[PDB]
Design a protein around this nucleic acid. Structure first.
Ligand SMILES: Nc1ncnc2c1ncn2[C@@H]1O[C@H](COP(=O)(O)O)[C@@H](O)[C@H]1O
Ligand SMILES: Nc1ncnc2c1ncn2[C@@H]1O[C@H](COP(=O)(O)O)[C@@H](O)[C@H]1O
Ligand SMILES: N[C@@H](CCCC[NH3+])C(=O)O
Ligand SMILES: N[C@@H](CCCC[NH3+])C(=O)O
Ligand code: NA
Lengths: 506, 505
RNA sequence: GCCCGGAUAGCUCAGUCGGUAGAGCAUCAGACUUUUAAUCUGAGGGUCCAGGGUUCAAGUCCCUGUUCGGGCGCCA
């Protein structure tokens, strides 16, 4: 059964292990990386042989071309770079050792090559080995798939196979790590302090998002995973540390979409004695420097519908577009929206429903004032911001978790940074009034409470912290994955996730 | 009184809100930070008054000393920086505003001061206020004590109170951040790649512990919480990324005590084409650099229990002590230790049992050959590592994820760094053999079925990844919290944790 | 939670009505001392995701189920 490669390879390796041959050596002394080898010994003329120079390199064989019984060509691939290995028995230790070592090497094997650098007569950089050492054989078949692997299921289930075959995934992960490093550097230079808040809190709190209930055996009580570190950061700000940040993981037991994952990484910082107006400039510097540093140009090309789909050229020039959504929505709808003062009344709800019907906007059967307005915004506002765009104060009906506007009435102070019709940043001015916060929590607990349950959906511990006095601060949150998607021309969150969640094959 | 104080202050704040004035202004543009203010204006000689520059600063009042009715001294508190505000009626906006602003400010309230820097004849830096704005009143009565809340319970349950009354806690967190920041940069400049492995998996893997069980609604199934990212790191190394590292959280479903938490942070890295003796230098250099960069010197004084008991003086001199484990235990053990390199059968468990019983060592009912050996080593050879020390060449049955010793038999190519009689970081040589790994997993699963509870399962995907070929690598792990305790002179894991888990009571 | 799509030899794809399923890559054995998707000569291989049905007859026609790729919902 020649096709049954796994059984044959396993038998061969078992025979090697039995017959006094170790196919898993403990240590191989690598002297130079493949990248440095390519960068250094590139000036050689074709048909050169640096006999005096001897180095050691290691990598995975990706091809085994046999031009004869004494000349076999290998293709080491490591560090995302490739190096040919022209194996000539004349330059080997001995003919018998040459045959013995070439009878075991197959595609996908990991070897340690010790030989002189050189170039072939066709001007291809290679290394003429003096002793090939088998490091870790590959038992399963490695497919010679051109244009790389293109099956989503195998690419996401077997990430190692995707990294071995495809080469751009390594670039994607490298770019994500740089993004994280750049955010850390910027925030640390601004004077912020990195913190590690608990990820397993004690009570659900007032969060419409479904939590991840977890049972603690010793405590004999349920624990809920962290949805957002908002409360702990603000309790730290009360303590005296006026600038904190944390790039951690969030857990939301919700659905999975192209841009939504149950577990995701976000960066959240809180700075005292500031506001969202003071934060748009910081966000501008953040994003502009990120795009300029990770890439080489402020302009980024994005494909929201795959490589064959429509291409969009976003521009990250630092002066991002700022729009107040009330005026922009009025202009788009071409009508005078009710004054923000009446927004809590029923006639504004009625008239907004009239806009939804007239302008052909869909909405679920529940049609509260915040949600249909959010629908109008989705189809008449963000749908046009290919470039980064700041949306200014939003109606208080959206989210009352922000302070009242200084000049405008009934307008929460917030902004959302929209890129490619998707929000990446979101910052608020902070409510530091204990009474208003208590009323908000009470309302959230009443909404979240399934029955006559209270406190469980509130954070009295936090409500006590605000009673001690919190300075006027401003929060800020960015989705790391939602930015890595745009900076890597990725339209799916699973492409930037290292090991995406997959149901068992069974 | 605290209830009366809260009621009175709440009524006063409500009255203030009613009468137009808002005690919670939206914004206050602070011109200069308190530390920068102090550093810039400390050069002044006593007695001057720079009536030319107006600066706006903010902080929390810590004391309100009264000297008559025409002079009130405030005491702002910044990031461990104290500035004294002396409010003078003559230099204020007006007398009426002076009275109206001094009749509403109490201890603990957050205020914003705008005015001219100065210094009285005594010689302390002050800012003469032109107007004082109340930003956030403190309704509760802040405890005024000359020592700072000493009740660890309150210190832990209410960390904001601890930070307000105690500054050392703030620095403890600064050092912790420095430790993590240094480690990331050290691996970064070595060429490592930072990764974010999943926190929820089908089954736990990477270490041996009791996991947390959750439920997923979208994918209807039970998902266990992360115990160690080891397996995913090894799959990544199989993929082609030679060097990886990750500083993230791990979860254990064990009891909560003075030195254990449900959630903790660990640093794990994996580099290919190396071995456990290659990390012997990297780990030593990283620890020595951490100690020198954070403390400022290579010697650290640590109090194992309380700041008044014995104070052992450790020394992080880069040539760390290196000894073997089995051989040193043989030397330490009064009686002869069985060869046990090829001996791991009932006889070895029997001899370890009689040794354990004879040495008055008590071990959990399993008394596993491994559970016996680790207890014996930890009770006899473990307590000599005041200075950092490497303990290498462990027996095979202790760790099921380490390659067999190139020379020694039935011994794992692993070492442990022990400082202050505690484990801070250990590293093995990764076992890339798929058949041997599958056997080890099968024995682990058999033990779990028989009488074990926190042992691991079979991970078929990891076995397939090993079948695809894993280069010779060496992993390395480190508990951040233990090093934070050692470098900040803390005997409790609660001290180095911002909001440590406590019994609900 | 609701709809639209698939699954074929180790793997990348063909397969017309319902009248077995084919080709390349890869694998194995050979020849070739300058190849690079090396070339040439030989050899294997499957019930077509899993079940029921429908039929004289099913990869094809239909139902359910597993698991992926999408859309609307959820994430105030
Ligand atoms: N489920 C999710 N999947 C991916 N990114 C998310 C998810 N939820 C939130 N984000 C990102 O996190 C950012 C801040 O979210 P929030 O802190 O809830 O305002 C958003 O703007 C998104 O970029
Ligand atoms: N139950 C636990 N709670 C908190 N920290 C723990 C617990 N178990 C182990 N640790 C930490 O894990 C460290 C060892 O990590 P490592 O050397 O990577 O195995 C210890 O020094 C502790 O700080
Ligand atoms: N942490 C929030 C911002 C502050 C929340 C309360 N104003 C976020 O990331 O969206
Ligand atoms: N993190 C591992 C040890 C270090 C990494 C070895 N692969 C553990 O403690 O379980
Ligand atoms: Na052929």
């Amino acid at each position: 059964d020649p096709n049954q490669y796994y059984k044959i390879r396993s038998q061969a390796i078992h025979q090697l292990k039995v017959n006094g041959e170790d196919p898993y050596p403990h240590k191989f002394h690598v002297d130079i990386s493949l990248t440095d080898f390519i960068q250094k010994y590139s000036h050689l003329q074709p048909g050169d042989h640096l006999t005096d120079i001897t180095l050691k390199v290691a990598g995975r064989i990706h091809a085994k071309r046999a031009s004869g019984g004494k000349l076999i060509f290998y293709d080491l691939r490591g560090e995302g770079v490739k190096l040919q290995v022209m194996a000539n028995s004349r330059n080997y230790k001995s003919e018998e050792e040459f045959i013995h070592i070439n009878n075991k090497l197959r595609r996908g094997d990991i070897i340690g090559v010790q030989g002189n650098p050189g170039k072939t007569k066709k001007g291809e950089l290679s290394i003429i080995p003096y002793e090939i050492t088998l490091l870790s054989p590959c038992l399963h078949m490695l497919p010679h798939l051109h244009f790389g692997l293109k099956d989503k299921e195998t690419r996401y289930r077997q990430r190692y196979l995707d990294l071995i075959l495809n080469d751009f995934v390594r670039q994607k992960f490298i770019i994500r790590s740089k993004i994280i490093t750049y955010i850390r550097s910027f925030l640390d230079e601004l004077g912020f302090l990195e913190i590690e808040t608990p990820m397993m809190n004690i009570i659900p709190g007032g969060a419409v998002a479904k939590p991840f209930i977890t049972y603690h055996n010793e405590l004999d009580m349920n624990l809920y995973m962290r949805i957002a570190p908002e409360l702990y950061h603000k309790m730290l700000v009360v303590g005296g540390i006026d600038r904190v940040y944390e790039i951690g993981r969030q857990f939301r037991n919700e659905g999975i979409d192209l841009t939504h994952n149950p577990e995701f990484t976000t960066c959240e910082f809180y700075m005292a004695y500031a506001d969202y107006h003071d934060l748009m400039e910081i966000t501008e510097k953040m994003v502009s420097g990120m795009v300029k540093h990770i890439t080489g140009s402020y302009k980024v090309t994005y494909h929201p519908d795959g490589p064959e789909g429509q291409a969009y050229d976003v521009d990250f020039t630092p002066p991002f577009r700022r729009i107040n959504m009330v005026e922009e929505l009025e202009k788009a709808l071409g009508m005078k929206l009710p004054e923000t003062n009446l927004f809590e009344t029923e006639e504004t709800r009625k008239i907004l429903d009239d806009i939804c019907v007239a302008k052909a906007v869909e909405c679920p059967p529940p049609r509260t004032t915040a949600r249909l307005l959010d629908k109008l915004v989705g189809e008449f506002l963000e749908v046009t911001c290919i470039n980064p765009t700041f949306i200014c104060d939003h109606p208080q009906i959206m989210s009352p978790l922000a302070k009242w506007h200084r000049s405008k009435e009934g307008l929460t102070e917030r902004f959302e940074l929209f890129v490619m019709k998707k929000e990446i940043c979101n910052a608020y001015t902070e409510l530091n009034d204990p009474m208003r916060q208590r009323q908000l929590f009470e309302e959230q607990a009443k909404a979240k409470a399934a029955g006559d349950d209270e406190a469980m959906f509130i954070d009295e511990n936090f409500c006590t912290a605000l009673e001690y006095g919190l300075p006027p601060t401003a929060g800020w949150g960015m989705g790391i994955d939602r930015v890595a998607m745009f900076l890597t021309d990725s339209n799916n969150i699973k492409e930037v996730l290292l090991f995406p969640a997959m149901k068992p094959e069974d």
